[PDB]
Amino acid sequence: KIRPECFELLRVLGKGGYGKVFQVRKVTGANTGKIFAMKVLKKRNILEEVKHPFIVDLIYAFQTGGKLYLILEYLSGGELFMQLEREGIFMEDTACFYLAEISMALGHLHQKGIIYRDLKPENIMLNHQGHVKLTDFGLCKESGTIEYMAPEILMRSGHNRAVDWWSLGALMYDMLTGAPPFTGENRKKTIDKILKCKLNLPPYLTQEARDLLKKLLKRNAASRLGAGPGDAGEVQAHPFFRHINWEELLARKVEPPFKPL
């Protein structure tokens, strides 16, 4: 059997949304001495039904009143954000590799009916190898006559795949310029900027990067890249990604730009 007693807490990886995440060592079983991450709820199926190179594995799940425990694989690579702010801006190729891997993860989830919604650099994690792992699934949606119906209503706006694709653009923008596309003195001001969405592209970007951002970072979800029935396929086919060999990338046979230590 498996119980909270089975695990020893080395440290706290993060306080979360109504959830804490620990670094633990297994003190019991055949995997004793093995290192894991424990996520706890005060009061799952999603994670179990996905086994991807670019998505965090789930090893054990168990319930005790009033708490739910999730036992995930530990990622030494930690946040990609650390790498970001370490330098200031990723080179285009370095950005492309991370973005390419995320696209594959997003594509898988979408097939699985899952939308990330949030793609902050904080969200993205790396494994020992230094490859992308996508982690948090708490704030994640779970996807008569129409003539006078609003466009937004028709496309299930706000709760469709397109939202993720936007987030990817913002992430791409952040990686390339060191800053997010729309930023404000305050939240309300920042929100308004995002809504206005008058995109400004720095001169130093390549045609490929600029074109992709314009396509990803566009307010109308329907016209957004990856918005389509193709999904990640549309984005992957973009000239930005021309160099990537997807089979190789999927295999994690492509050397990561940064290998932790």
Give the residue numbers marked as catalytic.
118
* Binds Cl ion (CB under 5 A): choice among 26, 108, 161, 215: 161
For position 31 contacting Cl ion by CB under 5 A, the verdict is no
Decide if 260 contacts 76 (C-beta within 8 A). Answer: yes
Q: Which stretch binds Cl ion (CB under 5 A): 14-22, 95-103, 189-197, 213-221?
A: 213-221
* H/E run at residue 213: helix 207-216
67 is in an annotated binding site: no
Count the residues of the shown chain that bind Cl ion, applying the rule CB under 5 A: 6
Residue 4 or residue 151: which is nearer to Cl ion going by CB? Answer: 151
Residue 219: CB minimum distance to Cl ion, A: 5
Tell me how far apart the alpha carbons of residues 256 and 103 are, in angstroms, rounded to a whole number: 16
29 is in an annotated binding site: no
For position 93 contacting Cl ion by CB under 5 A, the verdict is yes
**Residue 106 tokens, joined:** 């997003």
Residue 85 or residue 152: which is nearer to Cl ion going by CB? Answer: 152
At position 175, the amino acid (one-letter code) is M
The secondary structure of the chain in percent helix, strand, coil, rounded to multiples of 5, reads: 35, 20, 50
Decide if 16 contacts 136 (C-beta within 8 A). Answer: yes
Residue 92 or residue 174: which is nearer to Cl ion going by CB? Answer: 92
Backbone angles phi, psi at 175, to 5 degrees: -65, -50
Name, in order, each residue with C-beta under 8 angstroms of 247's C-beta and a sequence gap of 6 or more.
Answer: none
**Which of the residues 102 through 121 are near Cl ion (CB under 5 A)?**
none
For position 160 contacting Cl ion by CB under 5 A, the verdict is yes
Angle between helices 162-177 and 207-216 in degrees, nearest 10: 140
Q: Which stretch binds Cl ion (CB under 5 A): 3-11, 58-66, 87-95, 233-241?
A: 87-95
113 is in an annotated binding site: no
Q: Which stretch binds Cl ion (CB under 5 A): 30-38, 190-198, 220-228, 235-243?
A: 220-228
Residue 123 or residue 160: which is nearer to Cl ion going by CB? Answer: 160
Angle between helices 162-177 and 92-111 in degrees, nearest 10: 160
Residue 1: CB minimum distance to Cl ion, A: 26
225 is in an annotated binding site: no
What are the start-end ranges of the E strands in the chain? 7-15, 19-26, 35-41, 58-64, 67-73, 78-79, 124-126, 132-134
Q: Which stretch binds Cl ion (CB under 5 A): 76-84, 90-98, 186-194, 233-241?
A: 90-98
Residue 129 or residue 190: which is nearer to Cl ion going by CB? Answer: 129
**Binding-site residues for ATP:** 13-21, 39
Interacting residue ranges for Cl ion, rule: CB under 5 A:
91-93, 160-161, 220
